[PDB]
Design an enzyme around this catalytic site. Structure first.
Site, PDB file in Angstrom:
ATOM      1  N   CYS A  15       0.763  -1.185  -0.268  1.00  0.00           N
ATOM      2  CA  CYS A  15       0.338  -0.103  -0.077  1.00  0.00           C
ATOM      3  C   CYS A  15       0.861   1.223  -0.356  1.00  0.00           C
ATOM      4  CB  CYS A  15      -0.927  -0.305   0.976  1.00  0.00           C
ATOM      5  SG  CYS A  15      -2.309  -1.226   1.425  1.00  0.00           S
ATOM      6  N   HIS A 256      -4.812   2.225  -5.624  1.00  0.00           N
ATOM      7  CA  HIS A 256      -2.930   2.364  -6.430  1.00  0.00           C
ATOM      8  C   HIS A 256      -2.702   3.505  -5.465  1.00  0.00           C
ATOM      9  CE1 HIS A 256       0.294   1.592  -8.951  1.00  0.00           C
ATOM     10  NE2 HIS A 256      -0.787   3.213  -9.486  1.00  0.00           N
TER      11      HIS A 256
END
Ligand SMILES: CCc1c(-c2ccc(C(=O)NC)nc2)cnc(N)c1-c1ccc(O)cc1
Length: 346
Positions: A15, A256
């Site tokens: 992440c 994303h």
């Protein structure tokens, strides 16, 4: 490579991690202190401080994307969803608490509060009686609310807004027992490095509970904050320069992660997308990360900021001082070259 900077490998759902790692790497005064941590006796497999030194060293020297497995191993976030169960603020708190701890008793002790610590006054003022409590409160970032806020100014205004204490939530004024009061916070100081958490991920219950707010939220390249100080300094106005924009594409659950930086504070931005680093426009870094709307109700479109780094303009030259290969102690250099000498016998 036209930018002169190297990326970080994608090694699972980490992440926000690689975005953070770049952001701290380019906090040059932090990077130099990190190189000075006395890690010679550290266990090469349990030391978060060493693993951070190693990532910085490779970011500074490698031509290939830098791996992080030793880092994630060292602070123990190794399961499929370990980073999804946290957020960038806890990661950064943990990382920097680890490096500051390793700095205790050294010439570079106190680096973290020097760079990141600010002071507020938290006050409680009674309406119908004369008691006021004024206490100093230290902070190391600022969480800004963004729902219903159009820009950073509105977020800061909300942050210092007066909260009422009455009815079911009345104030314990001790000797004058329960009193109607007003609760507030004012800034006393703002730190050299200002980390603003934009509260797009808002844990809306009960109890589903995951959400992400994609509404438009503007932030400027130059951020004047003098008006939120209890007292301003004529010789040092609280003018901040945008340094980093940490970006998330998508909504809750899946997304994303990218970071935009102008590492030198000169307005020349780059996009850092895991292993791909490229120059971009100032518009891609800033305005294009405000979030927005394409369809009705939502779409979403969908690539917006969740964390910003500003540096005090008067501190920019110091925070972003040059780092050379001579700022890295030879003890560290030899250890890493020995590691790279053990990894190359495969
Ligand atoms: C400086 C890290 C930190 C600390 C903190 C403060 C001091 C120390 C320390 O001195 N430890 C020995 N460690 C962590 C406490 N709360 C925080 N929200 C943060 C933080 C700062 C920036 C971010 O982007 C995210 C989190």
């Amino acid at each position: 490579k036209h930018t002169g900077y190297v990326g970080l490998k994608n090694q699972g759902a980490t992440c926000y991690m690689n975005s953070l790692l770049q952001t701290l790497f380019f906090t040059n005064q932090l990077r130099k202190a990190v190189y000075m941590m006395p890690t010679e006796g550290d266990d090469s497999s349990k030391s978060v401080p060493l693993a951070l030194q190693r990532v910085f060293y490779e970011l500074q020297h490698s031509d290939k994307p830098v791996g992080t497995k030793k880092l994630t191993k060292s602070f123990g976030w190794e399961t499929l969803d370990s980073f999804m169960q946290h957020d960038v603020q806890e990661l950064c708190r943990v990382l920097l608490d680890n490096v500051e701890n390793k700095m205790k008793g050294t010439c570079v002790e106190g680096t973290i509060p020097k760079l990141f610590r600010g002071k507020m006054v938290s006050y409680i003022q009674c309406k119908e009686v004369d008691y006021r409590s004024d206490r100093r409160e230290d902070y190391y970032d600022i969480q800004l609310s963004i729902k219903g806020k159009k820009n950073i100014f509105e977020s800061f205004v909300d942050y210092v807004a007066v909260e009422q204490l009455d009815g079911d939530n009345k104030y314990d004024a001790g000797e004058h027992g329960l009193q109607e009061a007003e609760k507030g916070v004012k800034f006393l100081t703002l730190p050299p490095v200002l980390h603003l958490q934009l509260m797009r991920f808002m844990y809306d219950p009960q109890t589903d509970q995951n959400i992400k707010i994609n509404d438009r939220f503007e932030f400027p390249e130059q951020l004047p904050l003098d008006e939120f100080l209890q007292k301003t300094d004529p010789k040092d106005p609280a003018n901040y320069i945008l340094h980093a924009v940490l970006v998330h594409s998508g909504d809750n659950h899946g997304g994303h992660y990218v970071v935009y930086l102008n590492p030198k504070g000169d307005g020349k931005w780059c996009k850092f997308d895991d292993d791909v680093v490229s120059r971009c426009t100032k518009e891609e870094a800033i305005e294009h990360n405000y979030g927005g709307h394409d369809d009705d109700l939502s779409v979403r479109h969908c690539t917006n900021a969740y964390m910003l780094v500003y540096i005090r303009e008067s501190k920019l030259s110091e925070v972003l001082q040059a780092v050379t290969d001579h700022d890295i102690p030879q003890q560290l250099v030899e250890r890493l070259q020995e590691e790279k000498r053990i990894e190359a016998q495969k």
